[PDB]
Amino acid sequence: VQLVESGGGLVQPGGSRKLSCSASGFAFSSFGMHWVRQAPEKGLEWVAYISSGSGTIYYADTVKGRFTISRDDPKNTLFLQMTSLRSEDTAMYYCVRSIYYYGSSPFDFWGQGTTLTVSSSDIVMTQATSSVPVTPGESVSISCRSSKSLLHSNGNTYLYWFLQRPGQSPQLLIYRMSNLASGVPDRFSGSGSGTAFTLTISRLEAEDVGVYYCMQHLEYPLTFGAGTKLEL
Amino acid sequence: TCPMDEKLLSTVLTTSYSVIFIVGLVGNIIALYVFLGIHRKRNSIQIYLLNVAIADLLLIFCLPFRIMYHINQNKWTLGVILCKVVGTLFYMNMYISIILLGFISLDRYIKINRSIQQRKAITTKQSIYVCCIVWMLALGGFLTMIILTLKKGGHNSTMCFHYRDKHNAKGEAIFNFILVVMFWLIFLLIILSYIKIGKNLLRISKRRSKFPNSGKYATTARNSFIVLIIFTICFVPYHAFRFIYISSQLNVSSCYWKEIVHKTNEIMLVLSSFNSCLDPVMYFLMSSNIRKIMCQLL
Amino acid sequence: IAQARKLVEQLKMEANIDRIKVSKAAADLMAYCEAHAKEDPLLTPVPASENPF
Amino acid sequence: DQLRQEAEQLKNQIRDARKACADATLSQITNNIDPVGRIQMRTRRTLRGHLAKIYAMHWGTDSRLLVSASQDGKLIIWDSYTTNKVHAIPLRSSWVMTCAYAPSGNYVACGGLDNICSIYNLKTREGNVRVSRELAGHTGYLSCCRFLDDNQIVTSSGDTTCALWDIETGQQTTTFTGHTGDVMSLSLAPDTRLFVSGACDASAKLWDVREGMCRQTFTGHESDINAICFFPNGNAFATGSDDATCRLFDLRADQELMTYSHDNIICGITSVSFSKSGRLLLAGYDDFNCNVWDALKADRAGVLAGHDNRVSCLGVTDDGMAVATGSWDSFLKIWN
Amino acid sequence: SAEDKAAVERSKMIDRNLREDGEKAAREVKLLLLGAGESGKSTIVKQMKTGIVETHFTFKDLHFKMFDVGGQRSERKKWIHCFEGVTAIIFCVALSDYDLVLEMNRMHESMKLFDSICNNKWFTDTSIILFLNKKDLFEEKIKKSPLTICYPEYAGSNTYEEAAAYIQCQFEDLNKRKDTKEIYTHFTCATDTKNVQFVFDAVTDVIIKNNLKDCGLF
Ligand SMILES: CCOC[C@H](COC(=O)CCc1ccccc1OCc1cccc(Oc2ccccc2)c1)OP(=O)(O)OC[C@H](N)C(=O)O
């Protein structure tokens, strides 16, 4: 599975750009698709979502009506058409797949992302700190809190734990509470209640360092946490 | 209002209406029985024909008031309310039957002549949809016309089913004219549909690509022609004369034209209502399985 | 001489069987159905609060 | 003749030994137990989308996911709670007669008149359901595929024999022969140590998956056996034939425990399953309906009345919360 | 509920694809090929162009799926109902084996097989297209072997036409639902390429008959 983005670069304010996401290695027509963004050394921030078959489209309320989402299923290409760009739209954009049925992991694979530089109600998720130093072999517990109780009437708590290693793309670790993603070592675990949530890492190795993120789905818009960076 | 002689007319109307009433009652009861007791699954045409049977049953239930009125003294003993109820109900049931027969002809044409393999037998949904639309429109028109006539119309008397002027009520006259023209459109649709069905069945039978059941196609074409002829002879003369009925009924004229107009209208109503009794018998006779059942039981 | 040899060998294997009789084995099903009666959601109707259907 | 006489005498003395030591019938001991009354179940969910006869269904191991096989070559995975179609799989052969859900939920093996058991992988990286492997080697139609684990499965066939396969290699690991008719059903024991298969020769046989030996033989029906399943404790099994008689046999008593027939039913049994406690034996019959027999008193303590065609398949969840029934009218109904 | 709202949409898309597949599958003709083995069904299969063998072919913008179940070697009582709903049953019978024996001659094998299939409970509204193979061989054989060997009640000259007509009538009399279903007899040709045309005509007549039975005039 390989999602590759293009269209990044430097643009002047007031212009319009187009970002392409080419998929190769899976059934693009059966996957809903999210556009997410991350400001330089600030944190992740969801942009838009388009369901399978281009039926449902959701935009972030901060940018709603100013971006456009397009899909090509006979070509397996995702388009984000951006109309007007301020000084805040500069960021790294990621193209995430998401398939929704009973038991699916809808944030499994993330794209490599593309960079964009522009010259010069909603649930709140807050993470405790932003930098925690630790040595290998020591269990580390990270925590974050939500405003609403994410535990829906279904019994499922829509909490997602992602990791971004330095220089790499985000990778899914937990998708509801303790459901490990595909290819993630069994040392990670997650738990919590309602609003207070903890990600625990036992037997930490050198490759586990990076920025951890907690996100809620539960509703649109999707809101990310501050992002806790583990130091070593 | 010339107090003319009507004893012979009363007798012939009474006898003919009684015969039509009993024949329609027995035929529509049998049709209801065969459509409900033994028919588990229904297609669009069967739903349409069941609704036609219901409408004919209501018209047959309306008829005994007519026969009693015509036989007792040619006068209406009860109040004007029941007279208006029966007068409107008879005509609305008749036009429901006409519209549904038109729809039967149309969907038979689409199912026989131009249908290639099937339509997965999902045409029933639109069948109940059209049936409900037609029935709701019919009851709405019935209620609005009866509530207008009973209150706004001050003509209350002890005579019913008699000739009346339409100067005080012109909306009823224009609505009757619209009903006649829409009936004529439906009849044109029916005649084209059944002519095309019959011609297609005759050409299929005359091709004779196959020895088996090549005579059943000719039988079906003959049946299509027969049902078309029966509908025509039952309905066309009445709506042909109703134009003259409306023309004479909306302007002042001597009653010498009026007695023959009223007599012709009564005879034409007899012809129209005789279709209500014929209709189930056509389905019973023209169905091969039902015809064989009748032959083996008798 | 060897067409039904496998048949008779299988039948002989079906003779030396640890025979637990019908009264020693009916009580087993009885005990199993009594001990799991309350956990069966169809033998005894479940309250509608926990019912997912 | 010598072999015929020897077989006849073996059968005669083993039957005499089985009958002579039998203490009493099931009813003689279970009479004093009070009945269950009437098991009134209502259709909580109706699953629509199959456009042909439904021939098989299997419950997921989580008591929430379902797989169903239809004659139009479609294999549908439903979410039983919300009636959402989780998966839709186009089969290569439209003539599917049986199929099953893997105990881990990662696979589904399914087949029929094509002599092949096709195995599909659900938890793929591609987002679809790919065909994992085609198991071939049967010369007659296939019935009752049942996964043992992610890589081992037993299938019965019209070859008068059953086969234990190895999905990693694709080769028939073990072959169980001895039936003299089309083996139409099989059921895995709860403990994955034994299984029972009923055939068109009006007999069932208990076979060992590791030794491949004929452990037991069971007779008593007059016509071909269509369905079979284990009691949840793994010491009994119920068969249903075209005779319109359901029979419960004990694996250790070697004699039929009880008969589940009534005079009014004339058409045979199509499917058989138990409730979680082993108290309510459900039997989907040929006419239109399913009967809920009290598996201890042999009384029809409930009837599921829907299914305007023949009921072809039954299923009870592992927790027993619901029962899904599939019929020839292309409708799956869930009852609770 | 956002995940559930996407799951409902996915199920709706799946259901619409299922509806499209059903619409496509209802628009094709289903034929069940049956015979006695030595009836030369392979010749019919060739002229159209283990377990169950499906043959797909298009003729005059009509799609045909013909299912051959000759390689099943199992009891038909368990899987014949699977073919309830086929447009037609194409039966093949050889005319050369009226004298050859398999005990009992093969012609009675074919006749009793035809009687069993035609009167099957799952086959009441389905029509049968009957094919008579080995026309030239049967014509040449009867010049030295009388048909009396097969039918002792037959009384007629040992010519091709009379014997063939008698055989066709004998096959016809096996039908007991003379008004429900219909038997469609043909004599197979080699170089004329007319067998497929006969099958097309027969299936077209079957479809027309079903439509007429639906409409209510017939
Ligand atoms: C008040 C006495 O009425 C009976 C009769 C006069 O009848 C008419 O003028 C024709 C019927 C008619 C026309 C216009 C509006 C309503 C009418 O009544 C029936 C009706 C009700 C509702 C709907 C409807 O049409 C439908 C349209 C679409 C779908 C379904 C129905 C029709 O007077 P009387 O009995 O005195 O007889 C006079 C004379 N002998 C004779 O025969 O006309």
Residue numbers in the entry:
A (entry chain S): 2 to 121, 124 to 235
B (entry chain R): 45 to 342
C (entry chain G): 9 to 61
D (entry chain B): 5 to 340
E (entry chain A): 6 to 54, 182 to 234, 239 to 354
Authors' account:
GPR34 is a recently identified G-protein coupled receptor, which has an immunomodulatory role and recognizes lysophosphatidylserine (LysoPS) as a putative ligand. Here, we report two cryo-electron microscopy (cryo-EM) structures of human GPR34-Gi complex bound to an sn-3 LysoPS derivative and the potent M1 agonist. GPR34 adopts the canonical GPCR topology of a heptahelical transmembrane bundle (7TM), with an extracellular N-terminus, three extracellular loops (ECLs), three intracellular loops (ICLs), and a short amphipathic helix 8 (H8) oriented parallel to the membrane. The ligand-binding pocket of GPR34 extends from the centre of ECL2 to the middle of TM4–5, forming an ~25-Å cleft that is laterally open toward the membrane.
M1 is an analogue of S3E-LysoPS, in which the fragile oleic acid is substituted with a more metabolically stable aromatic fatty acid surrogate (i.e., three tandemly linked phenyl groups, with two ether bonds). Receptor was then incubated with the Gi heterotrimer (Gαi1, Gβ1, and Gγ2) and scFv16, which stabilizes GPCR-Gi complex formation, and the complex was purified by anti-Flag affinity and size exclusion chromatography. We then determined the structures of S3E-LysoPS- and M1-bound GPR34-Gi complexes at nominal global resolutions of 3.3 Å and 2.8 Å, respectively. The structures of the essential motifs and intracellular side are similar in the M1 and S3E-LysoPS-bound receptor. The most characteristic feature of the GPR34-G-protein interface is the interaction at ICL2, which is located at the root of the α5-helix, and thus has a significant effect on its orientation. Conversely, in GPR34, the hydrophobic residues in ICL2 do not fit in the pocket. Rather, I160ICL2 and Q161ICL2 form superficial interactions with the αN, α5-helix, and β-sheet of Gi. Due to these differences, the α5-helix in the GPR34-Gi complex is 10° perpendicular to the receptor, compared to its position in the LPA1-Gi complex. Overall, the GPR34-Gi coupling interaction is characteristic relative to that of other GPCR-Gi complexes and extends the diverse binding modes observed for Gi compared to Gs. Critically, the metabolically stable agonist M1 nicely fits into the L-shaped hydrophobic pocket in the TM4–5 gap, forming quite stable hydrophilic interactions with the receptor.
